[PDB]
Design a protein around this ligand. Sequence first.
Ligand SMILES: Nc1ncnc2c1ncn2[C@@H]1O[C@H](COP(=O)(O)OP(=O)(O)OP(=O)(O)O)[C@@H](O)[C@H]1O
Ligand SMILES: Nc1ncnc2c1ncn2[C@@H]1O[C@H](COP(=O)(O)OP(=O)(O)OP(=O)(O)O)[C@@H](O)[C@H]1O
Ligand SMILES: Nc1ncnc2c1ncn2[C@@H]1O[C@H](COP(=O)(O)OP(=O)(O)OP(=O)(O)O)[C@@H](O)[C@H]1O
Ligand SMILES: Nc1ncnc2c1ncn2[C@@H]1O[C@H](COP(=O)(O)OP(=O)(O)OP(=O)(O)O)[C@@H](O)[C@H]1O
Ligand SMILES: [Mg+2]
Ligand SMILES: [Mg+2]
Ligand SMILES: [Mg+2]
Ligand SMILES: [Mg+2]
Lengths: 401, 402, 402, 402
Amino acid sequence: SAAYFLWPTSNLQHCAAEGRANYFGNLQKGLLPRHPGRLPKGQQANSLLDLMTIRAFHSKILRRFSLGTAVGFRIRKGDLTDIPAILVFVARKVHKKWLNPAQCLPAILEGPGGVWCDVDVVEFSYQMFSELVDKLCGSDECIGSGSQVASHETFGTLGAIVKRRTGNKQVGFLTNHHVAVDLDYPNQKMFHPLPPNLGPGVYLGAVERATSFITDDVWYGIYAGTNPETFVRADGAFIPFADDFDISTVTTVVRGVGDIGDVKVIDLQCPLNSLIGRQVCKVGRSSGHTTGTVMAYALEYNDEKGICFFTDILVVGENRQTFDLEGDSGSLIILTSQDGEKPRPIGIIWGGTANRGRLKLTSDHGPENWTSGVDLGRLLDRLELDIIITNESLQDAVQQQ
Amino acid sequence: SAAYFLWPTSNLQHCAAEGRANYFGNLQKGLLPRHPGRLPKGQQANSLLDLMTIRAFHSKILRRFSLGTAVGFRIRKGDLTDIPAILVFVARKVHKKWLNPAQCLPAILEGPGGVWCDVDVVEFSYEQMFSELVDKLCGSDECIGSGSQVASHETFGTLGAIVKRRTGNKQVGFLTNHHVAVDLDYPNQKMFHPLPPNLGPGVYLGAVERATSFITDDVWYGIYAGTNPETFVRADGAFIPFADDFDISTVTTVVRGVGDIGDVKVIDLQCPLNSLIGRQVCKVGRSSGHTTGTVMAYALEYNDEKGICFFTDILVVGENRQTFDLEGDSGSLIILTSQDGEKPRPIGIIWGGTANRGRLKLTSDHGPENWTSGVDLGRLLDRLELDIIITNESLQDAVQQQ
Amino acid sequence: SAAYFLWPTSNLQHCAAEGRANYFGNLQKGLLPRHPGRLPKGQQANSLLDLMTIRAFHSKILRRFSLGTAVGFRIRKGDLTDIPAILVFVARKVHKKWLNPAQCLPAILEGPGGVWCDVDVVEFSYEQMFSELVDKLCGSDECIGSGSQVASHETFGTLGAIVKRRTGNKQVGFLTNHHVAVDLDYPNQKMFHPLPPNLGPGVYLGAVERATSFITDDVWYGIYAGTNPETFVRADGAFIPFADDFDISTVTTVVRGVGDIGDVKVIDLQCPLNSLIGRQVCKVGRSSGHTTGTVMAYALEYNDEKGICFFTDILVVGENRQTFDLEGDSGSLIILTSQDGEKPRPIGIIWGGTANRGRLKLTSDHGPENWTSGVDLGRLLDRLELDIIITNESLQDAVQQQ
Amino acid sequence: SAAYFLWPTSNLQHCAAEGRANYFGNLQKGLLPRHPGRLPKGQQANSLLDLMTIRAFHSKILRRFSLGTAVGFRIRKGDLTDIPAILVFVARKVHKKWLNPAQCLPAILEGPGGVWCDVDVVEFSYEQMFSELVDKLCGSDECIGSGSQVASHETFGTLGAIVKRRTGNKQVGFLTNHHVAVDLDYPNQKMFHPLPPNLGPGVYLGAVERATSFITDDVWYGIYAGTNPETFVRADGAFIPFADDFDISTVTTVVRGVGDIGDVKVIDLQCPLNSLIGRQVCKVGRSSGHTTGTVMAYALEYNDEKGICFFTDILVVGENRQTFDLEGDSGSLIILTSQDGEKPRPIGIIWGGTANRGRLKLTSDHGPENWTSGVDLGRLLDRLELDIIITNESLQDAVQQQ
Ligand SMILES: Nc1ncnc2c1ncn2[C@@H]1O[C@H](COP(=O)(O)OP(=O)(O)OP(=O)(O)O)[C@@H](O)[C@H]1O
Ligand SMILES: Nc1ncnc2c1ncn2[C@@H]1O[C@H](COP(=O)(O)OP(=O)(O)OP(=O)(O)O)[C@@H](O)[C@H]1O
Ligand SMILES: Nc1ncnc2c1ncn2[C@@H]1O[C@H](COP(=O)(O)OP(=O)(O)OP(=O)(O)O)[C@@H](O)[C@H]1O
Ligand SMILES: Nc1ncnc2c1ncn2[C@@H]1O[C@H](COP(=O)(O)OP(=O)(O)OP(=O)(O)O)[C@@H](O)[C@H]1O
Ligand SMILES: [Mg+2]
Ligand SMILES: [Mg+2]
Ligand SMILES: [Mg+2]
Ligand SMILES: [Mg+2]
């Protein structure tokens, strides 16, 4: 019956940011530990939460000389270590001899409660033809992860087959919301592989929900920065399958990977090494199957207009090959099987913007491309979705809608 | 609390596509149309509903050789008549001698049930005012009202009317064009007057709550206005409830440069045409200030490049060969001028001007004049579930209950 | 029958190239005007041929410091005089104090046989009227005549005159500029009024038969107008014989906005200058409608850097500092206005191309006025082998005698 | 003598437009709609004429969802088969699962008289070379022959073949495609090797005499290839007879890098397909030098935006995923490579235009390959009335009999 759009209404009147100023202020007044002295080994950062609270506390001394920050492990000579650090992204990485003490970043940083960590400096900036790509783009006899989805004006990738947690518990799929956005045209109807104005295809369904920006305090549960206009890039859209659409054609398998497990949630208190440095893979309609490494979490970026933006996952492709191309947006970021458990998804690729970023890891090599991913655990929670991972579970879920 | 956007549920499958084909199919085969057209005078079109149903019946024969259509009065020698007609928009209006019989549009057309009307041909296609009023609207005035410049981080618009929601807690707020609120590149939820914090000073007006972009014709008008099953009405409107912080003492329900307005005058499709078509209208917008024009036509059909049919409710042409609006006027109130002394009533709001918004030629001596697109305010408030507040006392009363 | 294009046979390889060289070679028995500088008044230039042969003799020295040249009357203080002169076009006219004597033009020149003339220096260089006449020309009129818009799939032009071919079948058709027809991107020999089938409605007029683009000076004028052996005259003509299906009852030999015209007035190079230079002319074209102007100069020389000499027959400047033409008028008849009561006779058609958008400064008070390029109609009809039809009765006689 | 261009008289409007309609009216009357016993193998399409007649008959539904069509052999798994088929070019080739029955192209089609064929779906769409051969063609060699760069003032092209005219004095000259000859701004009738005088050194080869741009299908093929009454064949050719001064001692009838060629191999539409479709071809051009490719299809249909049907004779794809030609090769001879020791015979010349070359996908693993357009040389020489000279002795003999 409703003919209008409803905004996400996460305003939480300014107390959710009034508490932000008061949070960092009241921690600021309590400096008992005493003078510049090193810090004990027992209080070393261990979790993602630790690194994020340390970085947020010193955001403003870090922001001044930096393009951004992220949490992870220290990178020395291009190789990841297992040392909890805050990665500071500089425009150009120069020798210490050319820095004044105000500019030179420290080697250690102690946050609230004496929790300390390392500070790593990284130099920073901002089609595949295969049998797999053709299958994803409409040559296969099935629709699944990686399949090209399209509205009248935009193309995207189908991330996962999902079901809604609330109400009807409708079965559908998850993709990236910019492929479904209506300002010039109506882009509510999704099709595979092409929209009717461009060529043949099948009507998948109409967009129901979409998140674009969610404040950090809601997304992470903590204040990740001092800026009161802080948003998380939380791109995701839920499209319930059309009442006519033939569910027999959908597959819960990620083609080129196999049977995947349930979503692996990024718990901010687990030890870092379970996410940072882990090998991930992607199947998308543009680059097909690629392999990469998780370099960092919680990428801070304060932009021209004065708003802080966080990007959850930072992946760099293996062997100096780009992890993704433009158009892979929506693709599932799957943790590769280590000794034989089913590969579990941790995120989806965020829509590549114009002039995507790059970081230099070694002098011998040039700058490599990095890919930005959205936390799948948090996205499914915010969109109120459950991922369907077996073909039998799919037909069971359809029965109850 | 919700963290997501909820898309409008105007899908309505499958009688919205099945019922459209079923509606036009059953009327076409049983015709009994007895070709020699005596067309008795009692069956002449009288309402807007009559013209739209006639146009919809002959949509394909009309769209075949034309850029689009709209309903109204026949235009003869550049002047509006009182003759009910379907306006057919041609790229170039050429003499009959240069048309084959397939191309030449008829002078009369009879629809379902023998209801007939005229067919008029119109040639069709698809800088700042500096004044104290414009400065007042753009932040120099001590108050916020209709015409006041509203802004998100990335886009500027005009405040149309001060409104209150009909449902729930009946929040008081304002109506503007949803193109100011675009969450694709940047979080453009917070609205400000006159400038966003990144560009300059201002006051936080509130956060967008509702917005309509496209509503199917069968929902908006209540009838099937065309044969295309993907037919949408461009209905731009966004509701921004005032922030709790906002000083509602600074709001005025007066339309500066017009005065105290009355309640929304609803466009009833069954009333006689002469109460909308040809009536003089006025607009106060942050770009052109106060302008005056005429309502030329209703229900502008346009079957574009991708194959989707789009309807635009109101078509205004400015008086004295002057543009009725400029870019940036989108959202402004389209007010019916007082023609015997009652309070001027609003009938619509300006729709956000596309790139290369068309022109139309009326007589040979003058070139093409600019036309302005409006959204039906009666239908927009109903769809958004809004009530317009027209007196400063009523505003103080509406703000209390909440 | 023929499926190919036949390029004109005006090559005469090395019959024109050395005949030019020996003409100018066995002239050197000439120069040394020894000794004095003043020449007798009895040998003053009187014709166009006199002025052109003087310019041709001193072409090398004149082209040294100038953008081009033309023949006419000296312009002094912005007004045409009665003094036969060679107009030398400089980019920027500076005071004598800033020129070396080599750069400064002599403002008198004697050619072969002591025929002398003046040298005038002119500063030189290289959006639509809306009216009922324009609308009628562009398809609103019930007839096709001079000024009517003609079109192929990709290009628009103006119908200049209704003509009949002199040779063979003596077919009736019309004359326009060939750049509306000549196309190696597409099939555009088919002409239509007012629009081609891909753009809108219209009637098939007929197919292009012959078209001239460049004609060497020695053929066009009959003399060697310059020393460059690659010297061409811009003669844009196109003869389109009417289709057999075409209703010739719809054609009018009347120039709308001028009236009944007389026969083509031939530009005889030996006549006194004042019969062409300075005469008032008018034009009816599909873009600017009816305009009025003055013939400023003839035989405009322009040597561009690829090394080819190009001549433009007529140079018109619009009256009252108003442009004589706009883009799209190409083909329009350049009609001599009735000065005492005789029928206005046509002398040329407007040239459509690239080097037509140039300006010349006549007075300091206001800036550079626009000039329009015309092709000699007398020479064009001769080269195309056409006769102009000027009365509607003569038209139906020509149609019946095919 | 003549100072004008003569347009081709190979189009007789609406005398032949009815004959096209009548031909399809005749096929539609003797429809013979039957299919009890599936498709006997004796009635299978064998010729190019068979495939073209089937495609034209079912033209309406094929073009409904397609970018174009062509005749040849079915392509299965990226390799040409021996199955007579109609190639339907789709923008993106999707699985049967995603097509409604209206969209899905059939696997077989039987046309008039029960002659049937297959329907193959192909995905379709619409830097320099440095070598000793390229340098020799572009002016470093001591001779002028096939592949040699020819130039007018504004355009560069390739010299295709050394020819003599069949009519009149049987002038000897050369053949290239008319976009190297044709002008809009300059009198670039004169051809030069390797450069025009404005750009650098060269020798004057001669002046263009004839040029074909578009020829209707009924004239070119001898049959009605499509139902559109505005149907044209892309027929780029230009005949430049050698200047009388030109030293014919420097001309070679040899195709450098291939050798001595045989006479033109005429594309007989009634011969078995395998003599053209799938045959290996080679090309020597001033941009890519020597390249090798395969004849993929004949009679490439393309109905563009303006509503005109365009046919392209030969469709070549380069071998081993390498482009068959580059920009500038237009005019080069498309030579059939020797299959069993015969001299390689030329069958066509490369076409130069706006629709020059798009892409077609043959396999999933490696991406889309480039295709090249060729014009039927057998038909081009007939239309221009030219004979190809293939031996240096025949050249010197042809020179004397002038
Ligand atoms: N603000 C700054 N801008 C540019 N360069 C800086 C800045 N601050 C520090 N650096 C450089 O970065 C260096 C520290 O780099 P980092 O912490 O990455 O070392 P590492 O990880 O131990 O070794 P590697 O450099 O091999 O990774 C300093 O020596 C200094 O030269
Ligand atoms: N498909 C078409 N394309 C272009 N022009 C057309 C077409 N069909 C009709 N016309 C032109 O429009 C004319 C009808 O115009 P219209 O109905 O507006 O006349 P009117 O309103 O009585 O007088 P006026 O022309 O002054 O408005 C026809 O005479 C014809 O010349
Ligand atoms: N090559 C040149 N470049 C620029 N200016 C020149 C050149 N040769 C002459 N002049 C200027 O032009 C003047 C002659 O102009 P022109 O013959 O048109 O004079 P006019 O017709 O006598 O008077 P008016 O200047 O009022 O037309 C010279 O006095 C000189 O200053
Ligand atoms: N209108 C269409 N648009 C896109 N794809 C189509 C269309 N019609 C058919 N197809 C696809 O093309 C297929 C037929 O292709 P084709 O006839 O080329 O097969 P083939 O040559 O036997 O094998 P191969 O596909 O290996 O060449 C159908 O299975 C269908 O999936
Ligand atoms: Mg490092
Ligand atoms: Mg009218
Ligand atoms: Mg002067
Ligand atoms: Mg195939």
